[PDB]
Homo-oligomer: 387 residues x 4
Amino acid sequence: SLHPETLMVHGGMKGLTEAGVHVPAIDLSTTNPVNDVATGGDSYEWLATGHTLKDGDSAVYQRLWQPGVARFETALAGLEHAEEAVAFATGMAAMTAALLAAVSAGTPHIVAVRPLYGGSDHLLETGLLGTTVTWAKEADIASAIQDDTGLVIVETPANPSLDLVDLDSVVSAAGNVPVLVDNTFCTPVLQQPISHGAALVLHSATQYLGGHGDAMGGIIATNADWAMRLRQVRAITGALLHPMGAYLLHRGLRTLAVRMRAAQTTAGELAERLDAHPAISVVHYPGLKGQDPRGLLGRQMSGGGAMIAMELAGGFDAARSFVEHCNLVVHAVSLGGADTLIQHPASLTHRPVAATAKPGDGLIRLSVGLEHVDDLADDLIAALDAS
Amino acid sequence: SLHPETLMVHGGMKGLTEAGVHVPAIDLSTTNPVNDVATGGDSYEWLATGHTLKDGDSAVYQRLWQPGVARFETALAGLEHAEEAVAFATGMAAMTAALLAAVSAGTPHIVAVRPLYGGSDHLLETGLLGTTVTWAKEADIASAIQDDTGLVIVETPANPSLDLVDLDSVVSAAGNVPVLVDNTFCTPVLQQPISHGAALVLHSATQYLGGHGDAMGGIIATNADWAMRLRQVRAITGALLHPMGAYLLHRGLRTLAVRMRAAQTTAGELAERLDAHPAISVVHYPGLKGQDPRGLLGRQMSGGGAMIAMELAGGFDAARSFVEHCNLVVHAVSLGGADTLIQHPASLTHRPVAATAKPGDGLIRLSVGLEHVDDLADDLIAALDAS
Amino acid sequence: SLHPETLMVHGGMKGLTEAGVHVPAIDLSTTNPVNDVATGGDSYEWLATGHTLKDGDSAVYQRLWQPGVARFETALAGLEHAEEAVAFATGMAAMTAALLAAVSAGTPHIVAVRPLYGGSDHLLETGLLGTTVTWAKEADIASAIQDDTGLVIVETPANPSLDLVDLDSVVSAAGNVPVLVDNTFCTPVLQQPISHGAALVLHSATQYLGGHGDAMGGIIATNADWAMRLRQVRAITGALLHPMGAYLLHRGLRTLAVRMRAAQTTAGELAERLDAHPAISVVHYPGLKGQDPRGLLGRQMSGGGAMIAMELAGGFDAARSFVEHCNLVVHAVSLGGADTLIQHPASLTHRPVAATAKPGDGLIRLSVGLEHVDDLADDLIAALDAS
Amino acid sequence: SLHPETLMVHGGMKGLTEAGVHVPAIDLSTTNPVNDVATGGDSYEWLATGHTLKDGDSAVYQRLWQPGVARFETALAGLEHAEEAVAFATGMAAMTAALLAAVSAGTPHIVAVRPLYGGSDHLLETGLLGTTVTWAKEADIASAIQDDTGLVIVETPANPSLDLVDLDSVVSAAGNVPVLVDNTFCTPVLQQPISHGAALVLHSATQYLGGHGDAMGGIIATNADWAMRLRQVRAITGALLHPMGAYLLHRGLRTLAVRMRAAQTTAGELAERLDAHPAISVVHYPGLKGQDPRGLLGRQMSGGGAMIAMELAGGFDAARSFVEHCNLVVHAVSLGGADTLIQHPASLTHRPVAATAKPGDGLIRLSVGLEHVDDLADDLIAALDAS
Ligand SMILES: C/C=C(/N=C/c1c(COP(=O)(O)O)cnc(C)c1O)C(=O)O
Ligand SMILES: C/C=C(/N=C/c1c(COP(=O)(O)O)cnc(C)c1O)C(=O)O
Ligand SMILES: C/C=C(/N=C/c1c(COP(=O)(O)O)cnc(C)c1O)C(=O)O
Ligand SMILES: C/C=C(/N=C/c1c(COP(=O)(O)O)cnc(C)c1O)C(=O)O
């Protein structure tokens, strides 16, 4: 019954007002005492087998359950409209757990759609976790699926070029196979993959959910079956989210709508000014005219986002000079933060990607922050004029 | 040239006094800016391929390098007398990385000697990470080794029964295969597996290294080849140790010698009093008479430790009543903390272990803390007399 | 040359990008080593006598200087356009330091204009710190000033009724006496009291500057003379802001403009809906028509704010029932947070105030958060209809 | 019924085991919601008037009550055997509150015995808080007392020269006037001033109670009357201890007996080696022969302590050469940490002290840590031999 702006502030804050406290406490306890051998043992088995902690039951150990992490999990699950959510140390740890869950189930094959984040792409290419990958285009998903396929890894807008994918078509092509959508760039503010029929939704909480570049994290909003499988892997592989990391990511969700709306407004205006510059040939931004032929803005995405990628006319040398002459905009990886960042994907985020699949050498990715539009445009224009 | 007691206080504190600060700072930065595309890209590749951060180089991203974690890593490596060390979110994440490093190298077979911690035992039994295991006795290690073997996993004193293993004999039997010794129970204060020829030394930093039951962690002190392999896995799977977790584990190392020496003294006295009680049939404690036939105390272990396991005369019912009637001693999992804890291993820590390999039903594990010996004995005796 | 929205993100972040880090580190060091007796001693004297730490000098001790606190201090001083700023544990500690500085200078008399926060009002009334106070109206400031006066204390919008004060007129009436302006409610986003000629500007950083209800703090943006006096008191009375408290308050400044602008928009709309309700007789909100006769909105305040006070028609019983029937809006003290709070000032914030000076029994104060306007209005209307 | 070693581990940990948690949680909440206007208002008045929070009552606001601070308060009060305890940001904030409590009661005069820490000394000399002072010798306390006297401030061993004071004689001479004893150097492990009849016992929790040089703090263990007065001052002046500061000082109490016993053993041996060196003329350490004529060791102090001061034969030049040539031992202020520190008191800790009352120019103070005795002696001897 409440709007998403209200649910970002009060999500995962259940029972705190009733207990006479304002924010969730940070419990650093590694162990959690048990009342007796029978209840302690049953709670251990329930949690180790991937189940949610029962109300009025001991967490037993942090690798089995953490209350602060659990609050962050229920907060994001409510925003994505998923049954449950499982949080890990990083976005890669969440990807690792989802791949190990599929391998453990007897479905090691993965049908993935490029572009994807460099690490997600490299982890599937190497097959470190016993996975086999089949790189397929959006239209050729149904054909690429084998009896051995466990998941369909997709991402929209893609990292770095912001390639869009119709989630309704992907779910239709996947059939009985579950679809994993990496909704890091859009966030639950702009896109809700669960509504389109995605089984699991991955987020690199490090970006946008944290929002201040000071909390690493990874989280998958999904149904109870996949949450149980992810928790089974988490309890034995232990890629845990620290109680303070969970606190800051949950804290960041309270300002996610106001931060996304402010950065999106700045980005929509910057993409127009940057397209007009002669040094830039192509500007990739969903909110621009022509960039949305399938009509996914409105239907799937309630906004253009705060990420802008661009192809330089002078190729690699112009792209290199552009990031090196930025002063206010900082040359660094990561996104969704309070400050504006810029980077060459082929040299940093997508460096472990295969040569054939690497992004363009003239391409530059930018994360728009909460600074004034004029000060960011002045700095980016001066950097382009330096070449 | 310095004693281990001095190195626990000043280890990993290099350059802090020279910078005008007392303790290492907690840098929560997820990203780390780069000077240019060339140096940033080269630093990314150097770190992603498992190398140590060069002095005067950007960390690029937290999943590649964290300075607070690095200080903890160098502090423990110096205590174990290893070349380097790699830290993770939990002890299970460190085990996971070591197993994935062996599988990635083309050696998925592991030769492990029981007893081991329930999770370490279950992770090998299930073969979640693409590993095959051959459970062998200490004397039958050489015969159990195949051309496909990547590691020899041992633990001494074993969790929970405190079974001792001659590390010189295990290294001799392994030959060309590297040996991984879990030194969680002994700590670098009491045992140095690197000196016996172990290639890698695992520690659940959650216990003893942290010492206050408020910091989860895992760390492997090893040579440069295995450290590079572990960091390659850590960079892509991301089971990272949070900057505050690293701060508290590093902080805990400063008091590790004084905490271990105090708890060991209390444990040596408790094991004698508990052996004299009629309710207890067997008291497993290395420092006790008859428990050390091979003369490993002095030679391998400088002391008896602060862990005591015991077999109850009345079986499961006496073991159950003993932990349920403890008041000062708390019924909970985990060890090496400031407080004394007690638990039934077959019901909790070793619950995911196979029925044939599970510990005795009358066995009880106890972690001795920093409380007065008389107050702990009074509580444990009253709990035994309650049945 | 930069806009205030840009300066909130990058303020106090000097040298971090150049050092290869994203956010300021949290240095918990209580002590700071010295190079020699001469430089250490001179740095001790320089800091103990209220001076700023020199570049390339030891902080010596945390009670003399803390670097994380110093970054927060320079960030807010730039936002208020003050020379320097001094931070303390709470807003009351900052008030205490300012009153102690005036008493130490030989000017214990204070001219204060009501309404003020309950604690600020009570601390002056009791004269705990050796002060004498003369409660004067805005027009009668010049007459109330004595040769013994050290400060003129004003607050606009006042806590709780939001009474406005013309700062240009107050500065003119004070003359040689410095004016302290508590700018907690307006924040540097909406008011620049230093521009009007205020010597010192006080903020309860706990509210708005922190913004998430999880960091207590107090800070005074002022000239070098008063900053020196405040630091001299801080070094000997030690009401220090903890390094983590400074980190979160500095972190909160990065989203201050987007949080204030979102809550102000919601408040301007709520004040019109609440004025139309029959249960409420008077709604105090500067943005509302008729509430600004002196035209201070535009000239002094660049916005109406996110605080709304109101007088119930049914007196105390209606005011009591209104806060007790709120569900989404929480009955609690404090303001400027991500969530909407409500409280009866005469019973809580202004309870230590003298009976004659206490606010109206039918008056209720409300802090507007970042929730959707419809969900907040629905809850507040239902609470009024419950009576 | 329990020993002090047991009470240091389990003190202030009441109800945690019963709630299924290991360590106390860190609640950063600035505000605490109230059930209704009547209970909220009554809880506000009860806390603002200096009373302890009732069980099952809202804390209302952090400046009135904090639960993590409260657990640290009850933990130390039990160790000192006091009724209650009040914690502040620093040791100077606690001194400030006690002095303001005496001034507020109508007893501004103080009878203080030197030597005292430079800050305590200077705060009394300046009379910043409206406090008159009469510097008296231990034997002349009774004569120095006026009808206006509110407190008798003493410290043993004194900072820096370790001068001992007979607490039984001081209490007898004070009579009706309460005695404040600064027990920072001895800690509740070695001295219990409450047993000798002291009304209030101050500690600079920054030293020894924290023990790792990363948590500033101040605390006074006292009867209910003085605790109420101290809390009345704390609620209005707000020199609060941050929830994380409270957590680390409480955490530090768990290892206080093992840290004190280890550093005391190292110090007793170092004082003997340093006395034998020709460069040092006098070694002030209570345990050494002749340094305790009144027999206070055993009767009042159960140990010599971990602080050593000494007079150099070459005067100031030898004293400055000694601290400047130390490498392992660090030249810095503060004490009771895991590492060994050294400093010239007249130039640093006691620099704001009057020239007549300042310590000797050849005097050097040293805080002994948890490093090996041989490594500390080797470094200190080499530093003396450098001159
Ligand atoms: C270097 C960081 C960047 N990204 C990461 C990322 C991850 C992986 O998330 P952790 O980094 O493991 O929390 C997953 N999915 C997406 C769409 C991502 O952007 C970056 O692009 O700049
Ligand atoms: C429940 C925890 C206990 N142990 C853990 C542990 C680990 C694994 O370490 P993390 O628990 O993942 O940090 C590895 N190796 C050993 C010998 C261990 O004791 C326990 O038994 O009490
Ligand atoms: C209970 C807290 C509230 N405010 C306090 C406050 C302070 C004092 O700020 P510390 O509370 O000392 O940080 C100073 N100045 C103003 C205008 C304030 O509103 C409140 O009213 O809800
Ligand atoms: C510079 C610091 C030192 N001392 C402090 C101190 C305090 C004052 O407490 P905070 O320092 O404010 O926590 C109170 N009481 C005693 C006996 C102290 O030694 C020091 O001596 O090295």
